[PDB]
PDB file of all heavy atoms in Angstrom:
ATOM      1  N   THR A   1       0.020  24.180  -9.297  1.00  0.00           N
ATOM      2  CA  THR A   1       0.733  23.790 -10.455  1.00  0.00           C
ATOM      3  C   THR A   1       0.606  22.294 -10.735  1.00  0.00           C
ATOM      4  O   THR A   1       0.693  21.493  -9.788  1.00  0.00           O
ATOM      5  CB  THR A   1       2.202  24.148 -10.419  1.00  0.00           C
ATOM      6  OG1 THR A   1       2.784  23.579  -9.237  1.00  0.00           O
ATOM      7  CG2 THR A   1       2.425  25.671 -10.369  1.00  0.00           C
ATOM      8  N   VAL A   2       0.466  21.888 -11.991  1.00  0.00           N
ATOM      9  CA  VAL A   2       0.383  20.573 -12.458  1.00  0.00           C
ATOM     10  C   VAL A   2       1.408  20.442 -13.620  1.00  0.00           C
ATOM     11  O   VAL A   2       1.216  21.193 -14.618  1.00  0.00           O
ATOM     12  CB  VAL A   2      -1.009  20.189 -13.007  1.00  0.00           C
ATOM     13  CG1 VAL A   2      -0.991  18.853 -13.705  1.00  0.00           C
ATOM     14  CG2 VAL A   2      -2.011  20.281 -11.849  1.00  0.00           C
ATOM     15  N   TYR A   3       2.365  19.607 -13.508  1.00  0.00           N
ATOM     16  CA  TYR A   3       3.473  19.467 -14.515  1.00  0.00           C
ATOM     17  C   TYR A   3       3.294  18.085 -15.151  1.00  0.00           C
ATOM     18  O   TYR A   3       2.894  17.094 -14.601  1.00  0.00           O
ATOM     19  CB  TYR A   3       4.814  19.604 -13.900  1.00  0.00           C
ATOM     20  CG  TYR A   3       5.086  20.930 -13.203  1.00  0.00           C
ATOM     21  CD1 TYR A   3       5.261  21.036 -11.835  1.00  0.00           C
ATOM     22  CD2 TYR A   3       5.173  22.097 -13.942  1.00  0.00           C
ATOM     23  CE1 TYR A   3       5.498  22.263 -11.246  1.00  0.00           C
ATOM     24  CE2 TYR A   3       5.410  23.334 -13.346  1.00  0.00           C
ATOM     25  CZ  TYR A   3       5.577  23.409 -12.004  1.00  0.00           C
ATOM     26  OH  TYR A   3       5.764  24.618 -11.437  1.00  0.00           O
ATOM     27  N   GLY A   4       3.618  18.045 -16.489  1.00  0.00           N
ATOM     28  CA  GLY A   4       3.561  16.805 -17.201  1.00  0.00           C
ATOM     29  C   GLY A   4       3.845  17.032 -18.635  1.00  0.00           C
ATOM     30  O   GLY A   4       4.250  18.175 -19.039  1.00  0.00           O
ATOM     31  N   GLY A   5       3.769  16.036 -19.479  1.00  0.00           N
ATOM     32  CA  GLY A   5       4.071  16.185 -20.879  1.00  0.00           C
ATOM     33  C   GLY A   5       2.972  17.052 -21.469  1.00  0.00           C
ATOM     34  O   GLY A   5       1.770  16.997 -21.050  1.00  0.00           O
ATOM     35  N   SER A   6       3.402  17.918 -22.384  1.00  0.00           N
ATOM     36  CA  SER A   6       2.492  18.991 -22.859  1.00  0.00           C
ATOM     37  C   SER A   6       1.280  18.377 -23.541  1.00  0.00           C
ATOM     38  O   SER A   6       0.162  18.914 -23.431  1.00  0.00           O
ATOM     39  CB  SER A   6       3.224  19.967 -23.864  1.00  0.00           C
ATOM     40  OG  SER A   6       4.375  20.476 -23.312  1.00  0.00           O
ATOM     41  N   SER A   7       1.466  17.247 -24.191  1.00  0.00           N
ATOM     42  CA  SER A   7       0.385  16.559 -24.879  1.00  0.00           C
ATOM     43  C   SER A   7      -0.696  16.027 -23.893  1.00  0.00           C
ATOM     44  O   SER A   7      -1.888  16.183 -24.070  1.00  0.00           O
ATOM     45  CB  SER A   7       0.934  15.365 -25.702  1.00  0.00           C
ATOM     46  OG  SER A   7       1.940  14.745 -24.914  1.00  0.00           O
ATOM     47  N   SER A   8      -0.148  15.326 -22.835  1.00  0.00           N
ATOM     48  CA  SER A   8      -1.094  14.891 -21.844  1.00  0.00           C
ATOM     49  C   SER A   8      -1.854  16.052 -21.106  1.00  0.00           C
ATOM     50  O   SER A   8      -3.103  15.899 -20.926  1.00  0.00           O
ATOM     51  CB  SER A   8      -0.306  14.031 -20.878  1.00  0.00           C
ATOM     52  OG  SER A   8      -1.205  13.479 -19.916  1.00  0.00           O
ATOM     53  N   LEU A   9      -1.150  17.117 -20.850  1.00  0.00           N
ATOM     54  CA  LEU A   9      -1.773  18.269 -20.179  1.00  0.00           C
ATOM     55  C   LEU A   9      -2.878  18.806 -21.090  1.00  0.00           C
ATOM     56  O   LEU A   9      -4.051  19.070 -20.592  1.00  0.00           O
ATOM     57  CB  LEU A   9      -0.763  19.311 -19.840  1.00  0.00           C
ATOM     58  CG  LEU A   9       0.352  18.963 -18.862  1.00  0.00           C
ATOM     59  CD1 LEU A   9       1.350  20.048 -18.790  1.00  0.00           C
ATOM     60  CD2 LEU A   9      -0.237  18.672 -17.500  1.00  0.00           C
ATOM     61  N   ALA A  10      -2.583  19.045 -22.314  1.00  0.00           N
ATOM     62  CA  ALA A  10      -3.606  19.590 -23.237  1.00  0.00           C
ATOM     63  C   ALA A  10      -4.818  18.752 -23.323  1.00  0.00           C
ATOM     64  O   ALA A  10      -5.946  19.270 -23.449  1.00  0.00           O
ATOM     65  CB  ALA A  10      -2.980  19.788 -24.598  1.00  0.00           C
ATOM     66  N   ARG A  11      -4.623  17.429 -23.439  1.00  0.00           N
ATOM     67  CA  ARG A  11      -5.749  16.493 -23.539  1.00  0.00           C
ATOM     68  C   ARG A  11      -6.646  16.414 -22.298  1.00  0.00           C
ATOM     69  O   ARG A  11      -7.826  16.284 -22.366  1.00  0.00           O
ATOM     70  CB  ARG A  11      -5.209  15.062 -23.905  1.00  0.00           C
ATOM     71  CG  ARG A  11      -4.708  15.088 -25.366  1.00  0.00           C
ATOM     72  CD  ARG A  11      -3.976  13.864 -25.706  1.00  0.00           C
ATOM     73  NE  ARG A  11      -3.943  13.659 -27.124  1.00  0.00           N
ATOM     74  CZ  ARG A  11      -2.929  13.023 -27.837  1.00  0.00           C
ATOM     75  NH1 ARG A  11      -1.928  12.484 -27.156  1.00  0.00           N
ATOM     76  NH2 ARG A  11      -2.964  12.931 -29.151  1.00  0.00           N
ATOM     77  N   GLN A  12      -6.015  16.604 -21.168  1.00  0.00           N
ATOM     78  CA  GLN A  12      -6.681  16.796 -19.901  1.00  0.00           C
ATOM     79  C   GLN A  12      -7.531  17.993 -19.842  1.00  0.00           C
ATOM     80  O   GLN A  12      -8.716  17.953 -19.467  1.00  0.00           O
ATOM     81  CB  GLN A  12      -5.670  16.878 -18.792  1.00  0.00           C
ATOM     82  CG  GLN A  12      -5.003  15.563 -18.451  1.00  0.00           C
ATOM     83  CD  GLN A  12      -5.345  15.290 -17.006  1.00  0.00           C
ATOM     84  OE1 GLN A  12      -4.690  15.723 -16.098  1.00  0.00           O
ATOM     85  NE2 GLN A  12      -6.566  14.763 -16.869  1.00  0.00           N
ATOM     86  N   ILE A  13      -6.900  19.119 -20.194  1.00  0.00           N
ATOM     87  CA  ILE A  13      -7.725  20.387 -20.355  1.00  0.00           C
ATOM     88  C   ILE A  13      -8.892  20.206 -21.347  1.00  0.00           C
ATOM     89  O   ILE A  13     -10.006  20.665 -21.039  1.00  0.00           O
ATOM     90  CB  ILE A  13      -6.772  21.481 -20.800  1.00  0.00           C
ATOM     91  CG1 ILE A  13      -5.733  21.847 -19.701  1.00  0.00           C
ATOM     92  CG2 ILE A  13      -7.584  22.768 -21.133  1.00  0.00           C
ATOM     93  CD1 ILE A  13      -4.556  22.701 -20.208  1.00  0.00           C
ATOM     94  N   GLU A  14      -8.695  19.625 -22.485  1.00  0.00           N
ATOM     95  CA  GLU A  14      -9.777  19.323 -23.397  1.00  0.00           C
ATOM     96  C   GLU A  14     -10.905  18.520 -22.794  1.00  0.00           C
ATOM     97  O   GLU A  14     -12.031  18.779 -23.053  1.00  0.00           O
ATOM     98  CB  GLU A  14      -9.240  18.629 -24.675  1.00  0.00           C
ATOM     99  CG  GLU A  14     -10.309  18.280 -25.666  1.00  0.00           C
ATOM    100  CD  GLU A  14      -9.777  17.522 -26.877  1.00  0.00           C
ATOM    101  OE1 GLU A  14      -8.702  16.805 -26.714  1.00  0.00           O
ATOM    102  OE2 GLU A  14     -10.326  17.606 -27.973  1.00  0.00           O
ATOM    103  N   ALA A  15     -10.505  17.539 -21.986  1.00  0.00           N
ATOM    104  CA  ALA A  15     -11.514  16.718 -21.218  1.00  0.00           C
ATOM    105  C   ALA A  15     -12.265  17.491 -20.114  1.00  0.00           C
ATOM    106  O   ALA A  15     -13.244  16.991 -19.591  1.00  0.00           O
ATOM    107  CB  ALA A  15     -10.780  15.554 -20.691  1.00  0.00           C
ATOM    108  N   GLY A  16     -11.783  18.719 -19.791  1.00  0.00           N
ATOM    109  CA  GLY A  16     -12.527  19.529 -18.830  1.00  0.00           C
ATOM    110  C   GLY A  16     -11.777  19.833 -17.532  1.00  0.00           C
ATOM    111  O   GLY A  16     -12.327  20.520 -16.723  1.00  0.00           O
ATOM    112  N   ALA A  17     -10.532  19.381 -17.447  1.00  0.00           N
ATOM    113  CA  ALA A  17      -9.738  19.646 -16.197  1.00  0.00           C
ATOM    114  C   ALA A  17      -9.712  21.129 -15.899  1.00  0.00           C
ATOM    115  O   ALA A  17      -9.511  21.938 -16.839  1.00  0.00           O
ATOM    116  CB  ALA A  17      -8.340  19.156 -16.409  1.00  0.00           C
ATOM    117  N   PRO A  18      -9.823  21.527 -14.676  1.00  0.00           N
ATOM    118  CA  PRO A  18      -9.771  22.969 -14.318  1.00  0.00           C
ATOM    119  C   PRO A  18      -8.371  23.443 -14.524  1.00  0.00           C
ATOM    120  O   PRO A  18      -7.396  22.893 -13.961  1.00  0.00           O
ATOM    121  CB  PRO A  18     -10.253  23.039 -12.829  1.00  0.00           C
ATOM    122  CG  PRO A  18     -10.851  21.713 -12.534  1.00  0.00           C
ATOM    123  CD  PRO A  18     -10.205  20.720 -13.448  1.00  0.00           C
ATOM    124  N   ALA A  19      -8.223  24.425 -15.326  1.00  0.00           N
ATOM    125  CA  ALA A  19      -6.966  24.943 -15.711  1.00  0.00           C
ATOM    126  C   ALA A  19      -7.214  26.379 -16.100  1.00  0.00           C
ATOM    127  O   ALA A  19      -8.125  26.645 -16.843  1.00  0.00           O
ATOM    128  CB  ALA A  19      -6.405  24.165 -16.882  1.00  0.00           C
ATOM    129  N   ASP A  20      -6.482  27.278 -15.520  1.00  0.00           N
ATOM    130  CA  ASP A  20      -6.584  28.683 -15.851  1.00  0.00           C
ATOM    131  C   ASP A  20      -5.504  29.108 -16.893  1.00  0.00           C
ATOM    132  O   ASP A  20      -5.802  29.973 -17.725  1.00  0.00           O
ATOM    133  CB  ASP A  20      -6.394  29.485 -14.562  1.00  0.00           C
ATOM    134  CG  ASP A  20      -7.559  29.212 -13.577  1.00  0.00           C
ATOM    135  OD1 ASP A  20      -8.685  29.687 -13.866  1.00  0.00           O
ATOM    136  OD2 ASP A  20      -7.384  28.543 -12.553  1.00  0.00           O
ATOM    137  N   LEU A  21      -4.394  28.467 -16.808  1.00  0.00           N
ATOM    138  CA  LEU A  21      -3.237  28.802 -17.694  1.00  0.00           C
ATOM    139  C   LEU A  21      -2.572  27.457 -18.099  1.00  0.00           C
ATOM    140  O   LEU A  21      -2.507  26.516 -17.331  1.00  0.00           O
ATOM    141  CB  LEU A  21      -2.139  29.587 -16.936  1.00  0.00           C
ATOM    142  CG  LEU A  21      -2.451  30.996 -16.430  1.00  0.00           C
ATOM    143  CD1 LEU A  21      -1.224  31.512 -15.685  1.00  0.00           C
ATOM    144  CD2 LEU A  21      -2.830  31.890 -17.510  1.00  0.00           C
ATOM    145  N   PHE A  22      -2.016  27.533 -19.331  1.00  0.00           N
ATOM    146  CA  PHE A  22      -1.306  26.385 -19.899  1.00  0.00           C
ATOM    147  C   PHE A  22      -0.004  26.823 -20.555  1.00  0.00           C
ATOM    148  O   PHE A  22      -0.021  27.690 -21.398  1.00  0.00           O
ATOM    149  CB  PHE A  22      -2.178  25.675 -20.944  1.00  0.00           C
ATOM    150  CG  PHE A  22      -1.522  24.510 -21.693  1.00  0.00           C
ATOM    151  CD1 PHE A  22      -0.806  23.534 -21.012  1.00  0.00           C
ATOM    152  CD2 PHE A  22      -1.660  24.419 -23.044  1.00  0.00           C
ATOM    153  CE1 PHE A  22      -0.246  22.461 -21.723  1.00  0.00           C
ATOM    154  CE2 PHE A  22      -1.100  23.369 -23.725  1.00  0.00           C
ATOM    155  CZ  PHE A  22      -0.436  22.399 -23.078  1.00  0.00           C
ATOM    156  N   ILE A  23       1.138  26.243 -20.194  1.00  0.00           N
ATOM    157  CA  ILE A  23       2.372  26.503 -20.890  1.00  0.00           C
ATOM    158  C   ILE A  23       2.752  25.263 -21.498  1.00  0.00           C
ATOM    159  O   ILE A  23       3.031  24.204 -20.893  1.00  0.00           O
ATOM    160  CB  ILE A  23       3.482  26.947 -19.834  1.00  0.00           C
ATOM    161  CG1 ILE A  23       3.034  28.207 -19.142  1.00  0.00           C
ATOM    162  CG2 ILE A  23       4.829  26.991 -20.510  1.00  0.00           C
ATOM    163  CD1 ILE A  23       3.939  28.627 -17.989  1.00  0.00           C
ATOM    164  N   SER A  24       2.875  25.281 -22.860  1.00  0.00           N
ATOM    165  CA  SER A  24       3.338  24.114 -23.632  1.00  0.00           C
ATOM    166  C   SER A  24       4.791  24.222 -24.051  1.00  0.00           C
ATOM    167  O   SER A  24       5.283  25.317 -24.185  1.00  0.00           O
ATOM    168  CB  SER A  24       2.467  24.075 -24.928  1.00  0.00           C
ATOM    169  OG  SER A  24       2.751  22.968 -25.738  1.00  0.00           O
ATOM    170  N   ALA A  25       5.413  23.075 -24.286  1.00  0.00           N
ATOM    171  CA  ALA A  25       6.785  23.051 -24.842  1.00  0.00           C
ATOM    172  C   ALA A  25       6.805  23.054 -26.334  1.00  0.00           C
ATOM    173  O   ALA A  25       7.921  23.005 -26.956  1.00  0.00           O
ATOM    174  CB  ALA A  25       7.595  21.937 -24.249  1.00  0.00           C
ATOM    175  N   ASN A  26       5.712  23.153 -26.954  1.00  0.00           N
ATOM    176  CA  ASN A  26       5.597  23.508 -28.413  1.00  0.00           C
ATOM    177  C   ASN A  26       4.399  24.320 -28.733  1.00  0.00           C
ATOM    178  O   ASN A  26       3.462  24.453 -27.966  1.00  0.00           O
ATOM    179  CB  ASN A  26       5.730  22.254 -29.284  1.00  0.00           C
ATOM    180  CG  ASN A  26       4.519  21.328 -29.253  1.00  0.00           C
ATOM    181  OD1 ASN A  26       3.479  21.695 -28.685  1.00  0.00           O
ATOM    182  ND2 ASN A  26       4.659  20.132 -29.814  1.00  0.00           N
ATOM    183  N   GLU A  27       4.385  24.926 -29.967  1.00  0.00           N
ATOM    184  CA  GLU A  27       3.239  25.756 -30.353  1.00  0.00           C
ATOM    185  C   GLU A  27       2.001  24.925 -30.626  1.00  0.00           C
ATOM    186  O   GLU A  27       0.852  25.319 -30.327  1.00  0.00           O
ATOM    187  CB  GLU A  27       3.668  26.652 -31.553  1.00  0.00           C
ATOM    188  CG  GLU A  27       4.667  27.667 -31.128  1.00  0.00           C
ATOM    189  CD  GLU A  27       5.379  28.373 -32.326  1.00  0.00           C
ATOM    190  OE1 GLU A  27       5.756  27.685 -33.301  1.00  0.00           O
ATOM    191  OE2 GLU A  27       5.570  29.663 -32.177  1.00  0.00           O
ATOM    192  N   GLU A  28       2.216  23.700 -31.120  1.00  0.00           N
ATOM    193  CA  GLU A  28       1.127  22.871 -31.595  1.00  0.00           C
ATOM    194  C   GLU A  28       0.155  22.514 -30.496  1.00  0.00           C
ATOM    195  O   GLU A  28      -1.044  22.681 -30.646  1.00  0.00           O
ATOM    196  CB  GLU A  28       1.788  21.556 -32.173  1.00  0.00           C
ATOM    197  CG  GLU A  28       2.378  21.728 -33.530  1.00  0.00           C
ATOM    198  CD  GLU A  28       3.664  22.642 -33.639  1.00  0.00           C
ATOM    199  OE1 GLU A  28       4.490  22.638 -32.597  1.00  0.00           O
ATOM    200  OE2 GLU A  28       3.797  23.308 -34.652  1.00  0.00           O
ATOM    201  N   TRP A  29       0.613  22.155 -29.292  1.00  0.00           N
ATOM    202  CA  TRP A  29      -0.379  21.804 -28.264  1.00  0.00           C
ATOM    203  C   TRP A  29      -1.193  22.957 -27.735  1.00  0.00           C
ATOM    204  O   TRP A  29      -2.274  22.720 -27.291  1.00  0.00           O
ATOM    205  CB  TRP A  29       0.263  21.005 -27.112  1.00  0.00           C
ATOM    206  CG  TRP A  29       0.557  19.582 -27.611  1.00  0.00           C
ATOM    207  CD1 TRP A  29       1.796  19.019 -27.834  1.00  0.00           C
ATOM    208  CD2 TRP A  29      -0.433  18.571 -27.957  1.00  0.00           C
ATOM    209  NE1 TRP A  29       1.672  17.724 -28.232  1.00  0.00           N
ATOM    210  CE2 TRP A  29       0.286  17.476 -28.394  1.00  0.00           C
ATOM    211  CE3 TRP A  29      -1.818  18.625 -27.953  1.00  0.00           C
ATOM    212  CZ2 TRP A  29      -0.401  16.340 -28.781  1.00  0.00           C
ATOM    213  CZ3 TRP A  29      -2.494  17.460 -28.342  1.00  0.00           C
ATOM    214  CH2 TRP A  29      -1.745  16.368 -28.770  1.00  0.00           C
ATOM    215  N   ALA A  30      -0.650  24.182 -27.791  1.00  0.00           N
ATOM    216  CA  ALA A  30      -1.391  25.337 -27.398  1.00  0.00           C
ATOM    217  C   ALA A  30      -2.422  25.673 -28.527  1.00  0.00           C
ATOM    218  O   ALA A  30      -3.590  25.961 -28.250  1.00  0.00           O
ATOM    219  CB  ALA A  30      -0.560  26.555 -27.094  1.00  0.00           C
ATOM    220  N   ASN A  31      -1.986  25.527 -29.770  1.00  0.00           N
ATOM    221  CA  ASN A  31      -2.888  25.769 -30.853  1.00  0.00           C
ATOM    222  C   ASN A  31      -3.996  24.669 -30.978  1.00  0.00           C
ATOM    223  O   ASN A  31      -5.115  24.960 -31.492  1.00  0.00           O
ATOM    224  CB  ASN A  31      -2.118  25.832 -32.182  1.00  0.00           C
ATOM    225  CG  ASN A  31      -2.967  26.320 -33.330  1.00  0.00           C
ATOM    226  OD1 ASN A  31      -3.470  27.453 -33.307  1.00  0.00           O
ATOM    227  ND2 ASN A  31      -3.161  25.428 -34.336  1.00  0.00           N
ATOM    228  N   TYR A  32      -3.760  23.509 -30.536  1.00  0.00           N
ATOM    229  CA  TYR A  32      -4.738  22.412 -30.330  1.00  0.00           C
ATOM    230  C   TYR A  32      -5.985  22.928 -29.538  1.00  0.00           C
ATOM    231  O   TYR A  32      -7.041  22.740 -29.870  1.00  0.00           O
ATOM    232  CB  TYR A  32      -4.072  21.297 -29.667  1.00  0.00           C
ATOM    233  CG  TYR A  32      -4.957  20.055 -29.416  1.00  0.00           C
ATOM    234  CD1 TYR A  32      -5.182  19.115 -30.361  1.00  0.00           C
ATOM    235  CD2 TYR A  32      -5.596  19.842 -28.190  1.00  0.00           C
ATOM    236  CE1 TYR A  32      -5.929  18.017 -30.213  1.00  0.00           C
ATOM    237  CE2 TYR A  32      -6.398  18.779 -27.992  1.00  0.00           C
ATOM    238  CZ  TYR A  32      -6.573  17.833 -29.027  1.00  0.00           C
ATOM    239  OH  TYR A  32      -7.396  16.730 -28.782  1.00  0.00           O
ATOM    240  N   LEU A  33      -5.638  23.609 -28.425  1.00  0.00           N
ATOM    241  CA  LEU A  33      -6.702  24.194 -27.607  1.00  0.00           C
ATOM    242  C   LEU A  33      -7.403  25.394 -28.242  1.00  0.00           C
ATOM    243  O   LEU A  33      -8.538  25.581 -28.023  1.00  0.00           O
ATOM    244  CB  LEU A  33      -6.110  24.600 -26.198  1.00  0.00           C
ATOM    245  CG  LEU A  33      -5.562  23.429 -25.402  1.00  0.00           C
ATOM    246  CD1 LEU A  33      -4.989  23.996 -24.067  1.00  0.00           C
ATOM    247  CD2 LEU A  33      -6.582  22.388 -25.113  1.00  0.00           C
ATOM    248  N   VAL A  34      -6.649  26.159 -29.030  1.00  0.00           N
ATOM    249  CA  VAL A  34      -7.324  27.235 -29.789  1.00  0.00           C
ATOM    250  C   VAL A  34      -8.300  26.664 -30.804  1.00  0.00           C
ATOM    251  O   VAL A  34      -9.422  27.074 -30.895  1.00  0.00           O
ATOM    252  CB  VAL A  34      -6.283  28.141 -30.485  1.00  0.00           C
ATOM    253  CG1 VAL A  34      -6.983  29.097 -31.453  1.00  0.00           C
ATOM    254  CG2 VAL A  34      -5.408  28.840 -29.473  1.00  0.00           C
ATOM    255  N   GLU A  35      -7.826  25.685 -31.530  1.00  0.00           N
ATOM    256  CA  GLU A  35      -8.675  24.972 -32.525  1.00  0.00           C
ATOM    257  C   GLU A  35      -9.885  24.374 -31.980  1.00  0.00           C
ATOM    258  O   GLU A  35     -10.958  24.354 -32.646  1.00  0.00           O
ATOM    259  CB  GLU A  35      -7.828  23.926 -33.235  1.00  0.00           C
ATOM    260  CG  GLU A  35      -6.846  24.461 -34.257  1.00  0.00           C
ATOM    261  CD  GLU A  35      -5.915  23.451 -34.832  1.00  0.00           C
ATOM    262  OE1 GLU A  35      -6.144  22.232 -34.589  1.00  0.00           O
ATOM    263  OE2 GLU A  35      -5.002  23.807 -35.555  1.00  0.00           O
ATOM    264  N   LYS A  36      -9.793  23.857 -30.766  1.00  0.00           N
ATOM    265  CA  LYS A  36     -10.973  23.266 -30.070  1.00  0.00           C
ATOM    266  C   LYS A  36     -11.934  24.307 -29.453  1.00  0.00           C
ATOM    267  O   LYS A  36     -12.934  23.904 -28.929  1.00  0.00           O
ATOM    268  CB  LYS A  36     -10.568  22.229 -28.994  1.00  0.00           C
ATOM    269  CG  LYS A  36      -9.696  21.100 -29.441  1.00  0.00           C
ATOM    270  CD  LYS A  36     -10.285  20.137 -30.415  1.00  0.00           C
ATOM    271  CE  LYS A  36      -9.257  19.095 -30.863  1.00  0.00           C
ATOM    272  NZ  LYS A  36      -9.778  17.744 -31.256  1.00  0.00           N
ATOM    273  N   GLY A  37     -11.534  25.514 -29.485  1.00  0.00           N
ATOM    274  CA  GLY A  37     -12.340  26.612 -29.009  1.00  0.00           C
ATOM    275  C   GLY A  37     -12.259  26.857 -27.547  1.00  0.00           C
ATOM    276  O   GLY A  37     -13.077  27.622 -26.990  1.00  0.00           O
ATOM    277  N   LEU A  38     -11.254  26.316 -26.860  1.00  0.00           N
ATOM    278  CA  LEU A  38     -11.043  26.501 -25.410  1.00  0.00           C
ATOM    279  C   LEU A  38     -10.106  27.658 -25.027  1.00  0.00           C
ATOM    280  O   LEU A  38     -10.065  28.090 -23.843  1.00  0.00           O
ATOM    281  CB  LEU A  38     -10.439  25.224 -24.849  1.00  0.00           C
ATOM    282  CG  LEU A  38     -11.299  24.007 -25.037  1.00  0.00           C
ATOM    283  CD1 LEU A  38     -10.520  22.748 -24.815  1.00  0.00           C
ATOM    284  CD2 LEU A  38     -12.616  24.056 -24.305  1.00  0.00           C
ATOM    285  N   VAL A  39      -9.387  28.163 -26.035  1.00  0.00           N
ATOM    286  CA  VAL A  39      -8.537  29.352 -25.880  1.00  0.00           C
ATOM    287  C   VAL A  39      -8.802  30.253 -27.049  1.00  0.00           C
ATOM    288  O   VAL A  39      -8.808  29.792 -28.156  1.00  0.00           O
ATOM    289  CB  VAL A  39      -7.044  28.999 -25.848  1.00  0.00           C
ATOM    290  CG1 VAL A  39      -6.173  30.239 -25.722  1.00  0.00           C
ATOM    291  CG2 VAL A  39      -6.710  27.974 -24.747  1.00  0.00           C
ATOM    292  N   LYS A  40      -8.948  31.545 -26.885  1.00  0.00           N
ATOM    293  CA  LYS A  40      -9.143  32.473 -28.009  1.00  0.00           C
ATOM    294  C   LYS A  40      -7.706  32.719 -28.587  1.00  0.00           C
ATOM    295  O   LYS A  40      -6.735  32.753 -27.860  1.00  0.00           O
ATOM    296  CB  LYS A  40      -9.776  33.786 -27.548  1.00  0.00           C
ATOM    297  CG  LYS A  40     -11.151  33.604 -26.923  1.00  0.00           C
ATOM    298  CD  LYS A  40     -11.671  34.791 -26.219  1.00  0.00           C
ATOM    299  CE  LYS A  40     -13.041  34.452 -25.615  1.00  0.00           C
ATOM    300  NZ  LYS A  40     -13.633  35.605 -24.833  1.00  0.00           N
ATOM    301  N   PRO A  41      -7.612  32.934 -29.937  1.00  0.00           N
ATOM    302  CA  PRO A  41      -6.327  32.989 -30.560  1.00  0.00           C
ATOM    303  C   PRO A  41      -5.418  34.109 -30.045  1.00  0.00           C
ATOM    304  O   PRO A  41      -4.172  33.926 -30.047  1.00  0.00           O
ATOM    305  CB  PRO A  41      -6.649  33.165 -32.007  1.00  0.00           C
ATOM    306  CG  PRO A  41      -8.107  32.785 -32.156  1.00  0.00           C
ATOM    307  CD  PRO A  41      -8.686  33.109 -30.880  1.00  0.00           C
ATOM    308  N   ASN A  42      -5.997  35.219 -29.633  1.00  0.00           N
ATOM    309  CA  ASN A  42      -5.203  36.324 -29.097  1.00  0.00           C
ATOM    310  C   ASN A  42      -4.901  36.234 -27.586  1.00  0.00           C
ATOM    311  O   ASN A  42      -4.354  37.140 -26.978  1.00  0.00           O
ATOM    312  CB  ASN A  42      -5.926  37.659 -29.370  1.00  0.00           C
ATOM    313  CG  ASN A  42      -7.179  37.862 -28.588  1.00  0.00           C
ATOM    314  OD1 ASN A  42      -7.728  36.911 -28.004  1.00  0.00           O
ATOM    315  ND2 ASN A  42      -7.733  39.078 -28.664  1.00  0.00           N
ATOM    316  N   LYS A  43      -5.184  35.081 -26.964  1.00  0.00           N
ATOM    317  CA  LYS A  43      -4.850  34.849 -25.531  1.00  0.00           C
ATOM    318  C   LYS A  43      -3.687  33.837 -25.432  1.00  0.00           C
ATOM    319  O   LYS A  43      -3.523  33.210 -24.382  1.00  0.00           O
ATOM    320  CB  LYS A  43      -6.065  34.347 -24.789  1.00  0.00           C
ATOM    321  CG  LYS A  43      -7.140  35.378 -24.673  1.00  0.00           C
ATOM    322  CD  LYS A  43      -6.904  36.376 -23.629  1.00  0.00           C
ATOM    323  CE  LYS A  43      -7.651  37.694 -23.770  1.00  0.00           C
ATOM    324  NZ  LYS A  43      -7.067  38.708 -22.843  1.00  0.00           N
ATOM    325  N   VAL A  44      -2.909  33.644 -26.473  1.00  0.00           N
ATOM    326  CA  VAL A  44      -1.708  32.819 -26.522  1.00  0.00           C
ATOM    327  C   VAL A  44      -0.559  33.681 -26.805  1.00  0.00           C
ATOM    328  O   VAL A  44      -0.600  34.439 -27.774  1.00  0.00           O
ATOM    329  CB  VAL A  44      -1.762  31.688 -27.526  1.00  0.00           C
ATOM    330  CG1 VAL A  44      -0.578  30.767 -27.408  1.00  0.00           C
ATOM    331  CG2 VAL A  44      -3.061  30.921 -27.352  1.00  0.00           C
ATOM    332  N   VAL A  45       0.518  33.669 -26.017  1.00  0.00           N
ATOM    333  CA  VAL A  45       1.699  34.528 -26.268  1.00  0.00           C
ATOM    334  C   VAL A  45       2.897  33.625 -26.106  1.00  0.00           C
ATOM    335  O   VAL A  45       2.845  32.678 -25.344  1.00  0.00           O
ATOM    336  CB  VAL A  45       1.753  35.771 -25.340  1.00  0.00           C
ATOM    337  CG1 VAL A  45       0.507  36.546 -25.391  1.00  0.00           C
ATOM    338  CG2 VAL A  45       2.040  35.349 -23.911  1.00  0.00           C
TER     339      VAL A  45
END
């Protein structure tokens, strides 16, 4: 587990950080990853 502000975590994942799962404290940062093509839209719940 790696904990931190949702924005920083997302940006790390975008940069290539190994991450299997991401839990954000808002919808926006998870959708950021969908928009960048790193998460498929139906794999966010």
Side-chain angles (χ1 to χ4, degrees):
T1 56
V2 171
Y3 300 113
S6 304
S7 43
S8 183
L9 297 173
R11 290 169 160 152
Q12 284 243 270
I13 296 167
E14 177 183 28
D20 296 288
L21 297 179
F22 177 47
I23 298 171
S24 181
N26 69 12
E27 290 167 318
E28 285 66 34
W29 285 111
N31 190 64
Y32 181 85
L33 301 177
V34 171
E35 282 174 9
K36 303 295 175 154
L38 304 165
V39 179
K40 302 166 180 179
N42 69 350
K43 296 279 159 194
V44 184
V45 306

